[PDB]
Design a protein around this ligand. Structure first.
Ligand code: ATP
Ligand code: ADP
Ligand code: MG
Lengths: 209, 378, 40, 142, 52, 51, 40
């Protein structure tokens, strides 16, 4: 018998006691990046037919990075609060299961839930835990992770521009990554979080004070 | 070459179909016809034309030059295959077999085109070949062959966006949908008039504007007319140079009914003397009249017949026999009284009228599958 | 095949409906208006 | 055939039936890498360089005898240079795309590693798949 | 010269005076020149909203 | 704790997965209330700035 | 940078909700990507 779809602990972010209760006005001095990710994620989610009609190839997934304490988690809290679509929110160092196969199945059923569920949104944190550079085929602990990256690298390619499934990925070190993850068709938008100097800084002072 | 190639067929119309009008067409069509090496497509047009027995040597110097380009294709096809750039014989006649499309007939065109279609692995030349087949399918009106390469055309634009190959294509589907009497689709392909371009075939952008307004005025209703063509600046500034067309549009929108028949007789007269509209010029104004009659007549219920001669258009007996044949034609929803001199309207439901075309298509398809049902199984 | 044992011996239809209603009526309906300007 | 999947019974492990083939590791390799496939129709104004690279690569496939007409060896190495963002990847992809050769770049990565072998102590183990797709071209970055 | 911020001021002033003297397309082109001029300054503190 | 690495030996990778698991578990998407962490070291030289 | 401009030029017509890309979007973009040429 065939089954209705099913996945692990990231069930939909149940939306009642699940908002991180953060407003857009809580983040001060991030007009470029907030307006820019507003262009990047939910503007194709609603106004899809302009991306289709003008035909400008809307981005599949987005990468965001920088020094820590620059709003990486908080921006996802705000977008996850004011979103209207389904939101899928995993912690990216949980695919290292002790049993083999639970990793790759845990990869594919999440994207199956994003497929079946809604025009939804994927979030992954600490991508440095998976996407590295060097590998060693003598442990199995490394071979499992190699099989993780092959599976997610496949399942990102298993799309057809028709589903409105967006992947948001926040990390700290861009250096310890594979550019094969950063090839176009998978990733095209890379957002550093630099330091606000004075101008956006005083807005943060106004908001906190 | 196929970029000035439509004026040729328009002037074959201008030669053949207006009987009195056959002098300047055999002037300028010969002016273009025995130059730029044209040989094949005017022997039957020479039969429909005059004797022109002096043009035998004109055919000989140009079958000689046709032989020159032919034999230098025959000079290219061995160094072209000696070192292989990219099938360089078909790289020569991928530009000169379209010359051969103009110069020779469709056959040495088509085998070289279905030939050369397999050369360029990217569609940046394939879809141009398909455009050429579209244009010669228009010229010889190959109404089955246009259906093939329209689909084979459209199947190529989805990779890439290619809106200079999709809106440019919408020009072709617009000209075919106005070639046939499919006007609500013809204006729908004529929707943009913005991405449309200063063409090779409508070298006047404003002639394209006249075409899209002539098809729009039937193709769409008041709400559409009262937003789209009336508020477009890009459509307004081009009829800004048009004295009559701006009048002919605004005589209908501004309830100027009497001059609307005058300018209607003008545009209908030129349409009668127009290529590609001369198949349906009578079809045009028989819809224009009943359209305006629907417009004024679906306002009031007790408006009399004698009111319309002075404010609408002269001739009481003309309005008599004209509305009589339209109620008798089963449209124009009203019911005229005669010997008390008053015109009464009603309103029908959307039931029996919508029922009618359903029993039409039902009987039509019943005839279809009945006929095929006797075709198969002996 | 296709023998017929012999004992005895778009482009057109919408146009043909134009002929069906307006078969022979007001062919050159161009000057009758200007002829009704003075009679009406 | 060697390197092919099969069906197998379980009680006596008698060979049951031959199934579909395994996907090629080079095909999976390029599927991982995802180079931007290209053509002549997306080249902007580099036609003399096109004429050079045709002389280098296009000739010793379609006319290998034409070098025997001159008695010289065939060229083997190409160095392209210039600032980044000037068409190197699309050009080298395009040439193999038009002459129908297996465009195989190398990056020294280690997700690629399991398809070359278990360790591949040299680079030279790539040559088995290279001569297994014998009309092939090797590409490299900086 | 080496200055950029005053070009925003004089093109924006032309955007005042051509629309105030009723010349719509030249005001559109001058406003567009204020856009593509203002697309190169790190701080439009008041010229941003004044352009807005 | 550690600073980070440029990926020397095969052991420290999942240790960094453990460490980043801890970091995301600190203040990632949670009202971390009523739970106070107390840490100690001899040298703070060798720590992640993210920690 | 040519593709950096002309891919970006659709964002301007999109953010002013057009369906036709206009020439002022391009020169509006050249100062931005060429402002990144004016960046470091
Ligand atoms: N507008 C703002 N801009 C920057 N930081 C802010 C702002 N408002 C609050 N913060 C502070 O920044 C802190 C870090 O937020 P967040 O966790 O999103 O940073 P981060 O970039 O995710 O860093 P890390 O990845 O190390 O958690 C918050 O605890 C908050 O106190
Ligand atoms: N001559 C060109 N014509 C068209 N696009 C080009 C050209 N040169 C570079 N590009 C653009 O640059 C990108 C490829 O960069 P390329 O120079 O091939 O590799 P690299 O930058 O690594 O040398 C493509 O996205 C392409 O659109
Ligand atoms: Mg964080």
């Amino acid at each position: 018998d065939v089954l209705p779809p099913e996945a692990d602990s990231s069930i939909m972010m149940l939306t009642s006691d699940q908002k991180p209760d953060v407003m857009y006005a809580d983040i001060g001095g991030m007009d470029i990046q907030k307006q820019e990710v507003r262009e990047a994620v939910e503007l194709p989610l609603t106004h899809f037919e302009l991306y289709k009609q003008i035909g400008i190839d809307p981005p599949r997934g987005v990468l965001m990075y920088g020094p820590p304490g620059c709003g990486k988690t908080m921006l996802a809290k705000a977008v996850a609060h004011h979103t209207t679509a389904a939101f899928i929110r995993v912690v990216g160092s949980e695919f290292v299961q002790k049993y083999l196969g639970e990793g790759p199945r845990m990869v594919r059923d999440v994207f199956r839930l994003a497929k079946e569920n809604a025009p939804a949104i994927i979030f992954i944190d600490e991508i440095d835990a998976i996407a590295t550079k060097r590998f060693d085929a003598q442990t199995g602990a490394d071979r499992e992770v190699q099989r993780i990256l092959l599976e997610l690298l496949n399942q990102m390619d298993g799309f057809d521009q028709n589903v409105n499934v967006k992947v948001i990925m926040a990390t700290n070190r861009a250096d310890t990554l594979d550019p094969a993850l950063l090839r176009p068709g998978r990733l095209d938008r890379k957002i550093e979080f630099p330091l606000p100097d004075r101008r956006q800084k005083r807005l943060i002072f106004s908001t906190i004070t | 070459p196929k970029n000035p190639d439509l004026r040729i067929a328009q002037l074959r119309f201008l030669l053949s179909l207006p009987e009195h009008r056959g002098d300047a067409a055999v002037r300028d069509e010969l002016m273009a016809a025995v130059r730029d090496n044209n040989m094949a497509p005017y022997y039957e047009a020479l039969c429909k034309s005059l004797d022109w027995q002096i043009d035998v040597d004109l055919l000989n110097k140009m079958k000689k030059a046709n032989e020159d380009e032919l034999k230098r294709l025959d000079e290219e096809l061995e160094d072209a295959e000696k070192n292989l750039g990219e099938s360089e014989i078909r790289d020569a006649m991928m530009a000169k077999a379209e010359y051969l499309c103009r110069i020779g007939d469709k056959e040495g065109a088509l085998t070289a085109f279905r030939k050369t279609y397999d050369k360029t692995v990217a569609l940046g030349h394939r879809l141009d070949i398909v455009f050429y087949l579209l244009r010669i399918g228009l010229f010889y009106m190959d109404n089955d062959l246009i259906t093939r390469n329209t689909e084979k055309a459209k199947s190529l634009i989805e990779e890439g966006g290619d809106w200079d190959r999709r809106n440019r294509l919408k020009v072709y589907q617009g000209l075919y949908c106005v070639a046939i009497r499919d006007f609500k689709q013809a204006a729908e392909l004529f929707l943009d008039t913005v991405s449309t371009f200063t063409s090779y075939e409508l070298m006047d952008y404003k002639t394209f504007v006249t075409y899209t307004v002539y098809v729009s005025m039937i193709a769409l209703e008041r709400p559409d007319l009262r937003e789209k063509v009336i508020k477009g600046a890009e459509i307004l500034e081009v009829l800004h140079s048009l004295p009559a067309v701006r009048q002919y549009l605004f005589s209908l929108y501004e309830c100027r009914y009497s001059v609307f028949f005058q300018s209607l007789a003008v545009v209908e007269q030129e349409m009668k003397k127009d290529w590609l509209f001369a198949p349906h010029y009578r079809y045009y104004v028989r819809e224009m009249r009943i359209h305006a009659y629907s417009q004024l007549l679906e306002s009031y219920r007790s408006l009399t017949l004698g009111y319309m001669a002075e404010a609408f258009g002269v001739g009481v007996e003309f309005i008599d026999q004209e509305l009589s044949r339209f109620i008798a034609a089963g449209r124009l929803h009203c019911k005229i009284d005669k010997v008390n001199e008053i015109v009464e309207t009603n309103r029908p439901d959307s039931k029996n009228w919508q029922y009618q075309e359903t029993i039409k298509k039902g009987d039509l398809l019943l005839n279809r599958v009945q006929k095929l049902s006797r075709v198969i199984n002996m | 095949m296709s023998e017929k044992k012999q004992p005895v011996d778009e482009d057109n239809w919408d146009d043909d409906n134009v002929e069906d209603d307006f078969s022979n009526q007001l062919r050159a309906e161009l000057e009758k208006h200007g002829y009704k300007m003075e009679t009406s | 055939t060697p390197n092919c999947r099969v069906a197998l019974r379980n009680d006596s492990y008698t060979l049951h039936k031959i199934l579909p083939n395994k996907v090629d590791p080079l095909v999976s390799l390029m599927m991982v890498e995802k180079v931007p496939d290209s053509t002549y129709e997306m080249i902007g104004g580099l036609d003399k360089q096109i004429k050079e690279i045709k002389e280098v690569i296009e000739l010793p496939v379609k006319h290998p005898e034409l070098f025997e007409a001159l008695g010289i060896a065939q060229p083997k190495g190409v160095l392209l240079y210039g600032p980044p963002g000037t068409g190197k990847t699309l050009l080298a992809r395009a040439v193999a795309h038009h002459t129908d050769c297996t465009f195989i770049r190398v990056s020294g990565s280690e997700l690629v590693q399991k398809f070359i072998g278990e360790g591949a102590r040299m680079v030279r183990e790539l040559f088995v798949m290279a001569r297994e797709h014998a009309p092939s071209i090797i590409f490299m970055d900086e | 010269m080496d200055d950029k911020a005053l070009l925003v001021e004089v093109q924006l002033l032309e955007s005042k005076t051509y629309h105030a003297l009723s010349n719509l397309p030249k005001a559109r082109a001058a406003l567009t020149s204020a856009r593509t001029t203002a697309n190169a300054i790190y701080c439009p503190p008041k010229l941003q909203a004044t352009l807005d | 704790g550690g600073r980070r690495f440029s990926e020397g030996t095969s052991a420290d990778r999942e240790i960094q997965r453990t460490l980043m698991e801890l970091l995301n578990q600190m203040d990632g998407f949670d009202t971390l209330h009523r739970v106070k962490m107390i840490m100690a070291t001899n040298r703070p030289d060798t720590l992640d700035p993210a920690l | 940078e040519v593709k950096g401009v002309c891919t970006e030029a659709g964002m301007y017509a999109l953010r002013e909700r057009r369906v036709h890309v206009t020439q002022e979007d391009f020169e509006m973009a050249v100062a931005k990507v060429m402002q990144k040429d004016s960046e470091k």
